[PDB]
Amino acid sequence: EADLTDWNLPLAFMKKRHCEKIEGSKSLAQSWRMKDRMKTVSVALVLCLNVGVDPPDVVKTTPCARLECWIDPLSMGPQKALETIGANLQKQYENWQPRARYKQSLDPTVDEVKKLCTSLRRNAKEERVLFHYNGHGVPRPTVNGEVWVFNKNYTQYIPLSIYDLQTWMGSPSIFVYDCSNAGLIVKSFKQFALQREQELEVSMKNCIQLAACEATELLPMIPDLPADLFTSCLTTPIKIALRWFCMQKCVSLVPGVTLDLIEKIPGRLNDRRTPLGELNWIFTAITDTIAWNVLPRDLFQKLFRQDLLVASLFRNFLLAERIMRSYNCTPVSSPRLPPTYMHAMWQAWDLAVDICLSQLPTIIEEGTAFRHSPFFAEQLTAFQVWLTMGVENRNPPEQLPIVLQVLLSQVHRLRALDLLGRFLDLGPWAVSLALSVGIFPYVLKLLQSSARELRPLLVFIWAKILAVDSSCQADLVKDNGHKYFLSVLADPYMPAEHRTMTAFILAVIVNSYHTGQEACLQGNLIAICLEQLNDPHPLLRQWVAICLGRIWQNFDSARWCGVRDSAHEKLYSLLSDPIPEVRCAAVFALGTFVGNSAERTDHSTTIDHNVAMMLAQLVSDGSPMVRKELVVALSHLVVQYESNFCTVALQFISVYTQIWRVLLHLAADPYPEVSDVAMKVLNSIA
């Protein structure tokens, strides 16, 4: 047949440079940065327990819920118990925010609270202060916007106005109420907030509030649970999460799991390789995932990313919402969250816990080696399955925030970095997502690693990020990540595909940014680049030359270094390169080399004339793309020697004579774009 003749023929002038326009893609409004990093500087633990005597409101049951910060208060005698609960409560918070001034108030007066709160605002001037209120020993908050504390003698419950309480506490602050009609406090807090705004004409958005209950509701009295149920959820989630798991109907599925085995669970909450730290890690992934999928992006970055303590409180609040729901309680938050209790991801938690503490009989008693959870493996598998047919802007993958959590260990880091690259590849829309979920500071921290297996994966990820957001050149020079890439660009065994990405990364880090130019110059870029300039890869030859060109762009120090290494000489080889991208990249660099002379004597001037005449033999060139850069390059030469070209220009109405004659040929170009740009530069002499 006559089909083999058709398929086997070169289609001339049908490539990217011809079809697409020679123009840069317009950068989108990148809004992924945390435009604020708030910090919770100090904490106020107001505990109104009055250990022993119950308030008149609530009649307690004979067995009853008694545990308060995992302490039976009635075991220890009244006074010691109150100090102990205060001590434990501090410790619990120090898991989440270990570097903050804690200051307890234990069965306080009103004056006592005033002096406490006013002092903490003075210290934490404009940074955030936490106010924790635990009103289990005092009557329920009133309709009139009041919260109860004691008198000096502990003979009368004194009311304290929420108005006065939000006077003493400042603007950026967070309030945690663990008492019975706690919704009333949140209502009345917002009322007095509106009331202050009306008085100000002739602290709302700043103030976050978490509350154990809706205004009508009462806290549960159930003997299995703590009294401190909300505080417990916020501040020790894994402990109640496991105790709650053992109270549900789903325990039938794991026989030999009582509450007593949960007490004796091995591990710590830091060590992710232990059993307890496994769960703690999984839990952090699950809650941070539920939040990201359920909340609008704005409100997510406000609560789950700005500051650690708030983010920890809201992560753990989602668990409170789930647990307390099962006892006719609805927790309340000030920036109101939509209901997460029925999110699918909770079924993943249930299974994760189940599998983890089905092992406890054998881990404790037999002394069996703790097998790790399949959680993170399977979640990466889901993320992978999404990518297969996930080429589109459809629903984004649920697992992005889990992929982030996996980077933190080493166990699944290689696989995640692979998948994350595969995801980032899909398009710049994806790189935007991955920056919004908060991948940036972890991907940047891995540049401190020496594990050589990461090098091809991180190089890939960073090329994708910097292709979208070029402002990250600021961050990479600060942390000395610019050294990480320099090493990869001077490594013969690293593939030429990845060395090309690396050369691009350096050409972005260096681009019009003296801090990055001075840093890469000292990391010996010019010597490294020249070693790879004659590679058998036309993309690498291209980028290495752009990279070389950018480093001495308006930077005389990198030019002098180029003269010693004799870079301009080694770049003349690229002027007769087959690929017209490379020829252009070479012309770019030799032009950028010429432009930053700063009026120096015979050494610099004699070099510019050698670079002039070498460019001046790319007039009769096939690509107009090369010829445009050839004009732009000779533009830099004209700007530098403007006094000399005025002599040549005024005459016809011998080096400069030659370069002006070149621009006349480029002015009378067949191609319109080259004739235009040549005409502009030629008229700015005229």
Binding site: T284, L404, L408, S409, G438, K445
Partner: peptide
């Protein structure tokens, strides 16, 4: 000073 603990 990062949010989650990374062990590089």
């Amino acid at each position: 000073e990062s949010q989650f603990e990374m062990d590089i």
